[PDB]
Design a protein around this ligand. Structure first.
Ligand code: F3S
Length: 66
């Protein structure tokens, strides 16, 4: 059981998360990312989740595990 969170404070709109996991993130008009509706990570996107997290230069992405 995974969900994804973007910390707006840390986020500087690099947009790596979006490029890697389009299904998981949306950017606002100003370039910042935020989790898509559900937030829950589908089984086929679990690797892209950790990948986006690993890839954020600002360490702005959080993944919770239950
Ligand atoms: S800085 Fe922001 S746009 Fe994505 S890659 Fe990191 S959360």
């Amino acid at each position: 059981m995974l969900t994804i969170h973007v910390d707006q404070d840390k986020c500087q709109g690099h947009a790596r998360c979006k490029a890697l996991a389009p299904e998981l993130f949306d950017l606002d008009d100003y370039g910042n990312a935020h989790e898509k509706g559900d937030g829950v990570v589908p089984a086929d996107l679990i690797d892209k989740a950790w990948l986006a997290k690993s890839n954020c230069p600002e360490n702005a992405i959080d993944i919770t595990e239950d």
